[PDB]
Design a protein around this nucleic acid. Structure first.
Ligand SMILES: [Mn+2]
Ligand SMILES: [Mn+2]
Lengths: 62, 62
DNA sequence: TCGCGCG
DNA sequence: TCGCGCG
């Protein structure tokens, strides 16, 4: 699905750029912050990423 | 302002109907839930309403 | 001590 | 144990 494909792009972004906050990932994938966050939290449910518990949270690959 | 006027309508709604959750107020004022909540929390800052700490919160007049 | 992803 | 108002 297109959501899966968007998630793949987010994973590629983190692989290429290292740990990142949502606002940065959103600017590069070119999606609004809420949409990026929807994907980041699904990716966390699916054990592909984790967040740092900072505010703002820092995201990276599992 | 129009925001003030919207807030007045929400207050009138609570005066006429008694304590209410946001979803109910939204349906009657005919505004989306987020907009109603924006107003309810401003009205709380301005000491005109309070919420019950229930989930969903129940709102009423101070 | 805004974290918010919420369907 | 969705509370979400967020500018
Ligand atoms: Mn908080
Ligand atoms: Mn909670």
């Amino acid at each position: 699905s297109a959501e899966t494909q968007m998630e793949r792009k987010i994973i590629d972004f983190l692989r290429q750029n290292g740990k990142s906050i949502a606002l940065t990932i959103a600017k590069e994938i070119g999606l609004d912050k809420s949409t990026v966050n929807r994907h980041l939290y699904n990716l966390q449910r699916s054990n592909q990423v984790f967040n740092s518990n900072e505010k703002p949270p820092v995201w990276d690959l599992m």
